[PDB]
Amino acid sequence: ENEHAKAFLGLAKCEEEVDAIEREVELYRLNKMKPVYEKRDAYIDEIAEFWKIVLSQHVSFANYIRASDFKYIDTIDKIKVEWLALESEMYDTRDFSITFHFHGIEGDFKEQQVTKVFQIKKDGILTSEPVPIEWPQSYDSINPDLIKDKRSPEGKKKYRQGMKTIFGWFRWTGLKPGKEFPHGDSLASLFSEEIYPFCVKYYAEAQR
Amino acid sequence: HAKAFLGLAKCEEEVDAIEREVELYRLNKMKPVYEKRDAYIDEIAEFWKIVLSQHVSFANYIRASDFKYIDTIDKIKVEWLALESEMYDTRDFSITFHFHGIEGDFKEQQVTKVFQIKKDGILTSEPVPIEWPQSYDSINPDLIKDKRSPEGKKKYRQGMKTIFGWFRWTGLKPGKEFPHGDSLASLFSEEIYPFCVKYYAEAQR
């Protein structure tokens, strides 16, 4: 019992050392990868429908967003993730900004660049701040900033629809559970951990 | 397009080089930590027995009977071969089991199996001697007399599906060995050995 307690305490400390190691290793990886991502993304910028192809290829991504969203997701010409811990070691290694550029759709959806920023709070949860994005005209009836009667049976339905779109995700903060785009934090991690890092592999899978 | 694709292939190779350096960095830093960790683990009665029954998918690979023998594992040690030679893939490892045994049935014994990548790459291995339980004589490949006989083929296949059949696994004869012997190997090197303490804590929780 004292032998086991001694062992458990020893193991608790070993686990902290492992965490310390994982951070140091990830920081090193991030630094080494930065110039490689810069070169890679320059080649990607030359590829026609790269991101459209990549986002239709990811198995999980489609589950997070509305079917109607896909005509607008098809307009993404650039995705850029930047890891904040490269700016400051005070950041968690999971902290990042993501920049989208949409080419837009004539007469319906604005050509625009949008940057959303994700940071860990105290384990640890991703949080964000809302960022301006212009919603497409097709979505005017489900646009949160446009809906007139939010607490009227029809308006509640319309508010709920709008907030489950990819555009609702740009409002997500992670600070009001149950009131925001569902699983906004999981979607964020999908971009930082899967989509952005492995996009070229997804693009090749879509060809094969 | 062609320029872009060629550039991306060069970038992919740059990423591979970095991923190897990063994993070697991780593994070198982990070595002394694993050593101290495993020393504490040695002080804990049925640590591995608890861990192996706690893992989600481990149970799926082996015969139900085998758990009587897996329950006697009192030490698992993984060593990454790339730390010894640059010529090795970072996935290459040896795994050493100690079994406390069961009197009259299963000998106390230490067994080491080695896994190496051959060309992405597939995990391969060599057979390593392990003394099978006496209770498993009828399904022991080295003891089955008439293998090319409906009854013998069935006994043979039974034995090949035990954890003891896994010690014979090579990855060189598909359809003829312990099913998914390579996925089980990766379960040890990637999940069970690195995260055993998390599993043990989950079981106590």
CB atoms under 10 Å from CB of A128, counted, come to: 22
Q: Which of A3, A14, A28 sits opposite B43 (nearest CB)?
A: A3
Q: Sign of torsion, CA B164 B169 B117 B7?
A: negative
| DSSP-based three-state secondary structure for B129 | coil
Q: Which of B22, B29, B37 sits opposite A14 (nearest CB)?
A: B37
CA distance B15 to chain A (A): 7
- What are the C-alpha distances in Å from A48 to residues A45, A197, A203, B11? 8, 19, 12, 19
Q: What are phi and psi of A127, to 5 degrees?
A: -135, 165
Method: X-ray
Cβ–Cβ < 8 Å for B170, B125: yes
| DSSP-based three-state secondary structure for B186 | helix
Alpha-carbon dihedral A162, A163, A168, A172, rounded to 10 degrees: 170
Three-point CA angle A123, A126, A132, nearest 5°: 170
Alpha-carbon dihedral B140, B123, B68, B191, rounded to 10 degrees: 180
Entry resolution (Å): 2.0
Q: Which of B31, B205, B29, B124 is nearest to A8 (CA)?
A: B205
Count of residues for chain B?
205
* Chain B residues close to A36, C-beta within 8 Å: 11, 14-15, 18
| DSSP-based three-state secondary structure for B30 | helix
Quick one: chain B helix, strand, coil %, rounded to 5? 50, 15, 35
CA distance B179 to chain A (A): 27
Q: Which residues of A touch B (CB under 8 A)?
A: 3-4, 6-7, 10-11, 14-15, 17-18, 21-22, 24-25, 28-29, 32-33, 36, 39-40, 42-44, 46-48, 200
With CB atoms and an 8 Å threshold, state whether A14 touches B40.
yes
* Chain B residues close to A204, C-beta within 8 Å: none
**Can you say whether residue A92 is alpha, beta or left, with left for phi > 0 and alpha for psi between -120 and 50 degrees?**
beta
**Which residues face A102 on adjacent strands?**
A76, A112
SS (H, E, C) chain A: CHHHHHHHHHHHHHHHHHHHHHHHHHHHHHHHHHHHHHHHHHHHCCCCCHHHHHHHHCCCHHHHCCHHHHHHHCCEEEEEEEEHHHCCCCCCCCCEEEEEEECCECCCECCEEEEEEEEEECCCEEEECCCCCCCCHHHHHHCCCCCCCCCCHHHHHHHHHHHCCHHHHCCCCCCCCCCCCCCHHHHHHHHHHHHHHHHHHHHHHHHC
CA distance B115 to B95: 8
With CB atoms and an 8 Å threshold, state whether B43 touches A7.
yes
Rg (CA), chain A: 20
The residue in chain B having the minimum alpha-carbon distance to the alpha carbon of residue A1 is B44
Cβ–Cβ < 8 Å for B104, B126: no
DSSP state of A131: -
